[PDB]
């Protein structure tokens, strides 16, 4: 064809049951992870002379919700530049026309692992608090851009062996806040719940609230933390409220019982203090009613976290988001495909 000459910019490699077709600069692809949206490889970028990560997203325009999330991810990864948010190095599609376009490849800095194996390590307070600080800095930065995540979880947070941390994406069941799973309103501190779930899991090993489904998720939460107040119940839609109220009246456990000293270090007065501080922060993050839950700014000032505080990191000015791109405007699926294709072709280096 007329555009067929473009194909020579790329080559293909089989990765499991998928073909990766990438720019020739990216060499020796190897799988490093998988999620729902994409398959991720490590590669050597011969132009930058460094290793990178490459995520393949197929058919990001499959419906309006998927398309909005994908477009927002491209826009935000481009305009955001913060040490605790994964950076965009390149984006491309190997297909040569709008009609043939299906796959988007996002090239990022290569981190070493996701937070999953860290959670199972024996972490001291120094490493736990620094990881949590970094997560809070990244979340604060997103919130300052008008971006509330709602879906933070260990698989979308990555680390390096120097204990640095970056969040992989920009959001929208074990880690989702009550207000998300129950379809209520939400505000910024929706993301504090998820931080609390991850912190709690670092200490307890097991997922705190391992619901087998939606209602089971709620049951795990109230069994541990107690049935919420009538003030909370009145904020529920009528059908949801009937469910939520139609079960046993759990009182919950104290945070001393949920997170006893035996799960923390006890070799010193310093560590005794830090166990108490960690438990105190957990008691302020793992709060069902968001109106009584700590904010991100308050968490960053909490003594457990604040030892790491640096305003150049926590108060970095927000990105300039380009006009309308992060709108609430709606579009047909064909229009969404066109918008994403245009963004991909514009963004490529």
């Amino acid at each position: 064809g007329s555009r067929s000459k473009r194909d020579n910019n790329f080559y293909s490699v089989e990765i499991g049951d998928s073909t990766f077709t990438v720019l020739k600069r990216y060499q020796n692809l190897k799988p490093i992870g998988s999620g729902a949206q994409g398959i991720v490889c490590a590669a050597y970028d011969a132009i930058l002379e460094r290793n990178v990560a490459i995520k393949k997203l197929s058919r990001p325009f499959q419906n309006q919700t998927h398309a909005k999330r994908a477009y927002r991810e491209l826009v935000l990864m481009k305009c955001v530049n913060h040490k605790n948010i994964i950076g965009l190095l390149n984006v491309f599609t190997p297909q040569k026309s709008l009609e043939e376009f299906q796959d988007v490849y996002i090239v990022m800095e290569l981190m070493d692992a996701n937070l999953c194996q860290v959670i199972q390590m024996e972490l001291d307070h120094e490493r736990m608090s620094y990881l949590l600080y970094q997560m809070l800095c990244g979340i604060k930065h997103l919130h300052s851009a008008g971006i509330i995540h709602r879906d933070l979880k260990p698989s979308n947070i990555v680390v390096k062996s120097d204990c640095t941390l970056k969040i992989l994406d920009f959001g929208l069941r074990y880690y989702r806040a009550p207000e998300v799973i129950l379809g209520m309103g939400y505000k910024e501190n929706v993301d504090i719940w998820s931080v609390g779930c991850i912190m709690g899991e670092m200490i307890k090993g097991g997922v705190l609230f391992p619901g087998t489904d939606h209602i089971d998720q709620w049951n795990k939460v109230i069994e541990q933390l107690g049935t919420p107040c009538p003030e909370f119940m009145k904020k529920l839609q009528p059908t949801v409220r009937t469910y939520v109220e139609n079960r046993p009246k759990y009182a919950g456990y104290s945070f001393e019982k949920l997170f006893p000293d035996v799960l923390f270090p006890a070799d010193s007065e310093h560590n005794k203090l830090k166990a108490s501080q960690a438990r105190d922060l957990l008691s302020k993050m793992l709060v069902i009613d968001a109106s009584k839950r700590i904010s991100v700014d308050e968490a960053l000032q909490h003594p457990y976290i604040n030892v790491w505080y640096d305003p150049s990191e926590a108060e970095a000015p927000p990105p300039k988001i380009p006009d309308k791109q992060l709108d609430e405007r709606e579009h047909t699926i064909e229009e969404w495909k066109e918008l994403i294709y245009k963004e991909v072709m514009d963004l490529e280096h």
Partner: peptide, 12 residues
């Protein structure tokens, strides 16, 4: 009381 450059995660 480590400096940040002394925090190490033994990832595998």
């Amino acid at each position: 009381r480590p400096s940040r450059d002394h925090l190490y995660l033994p990832l595998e």
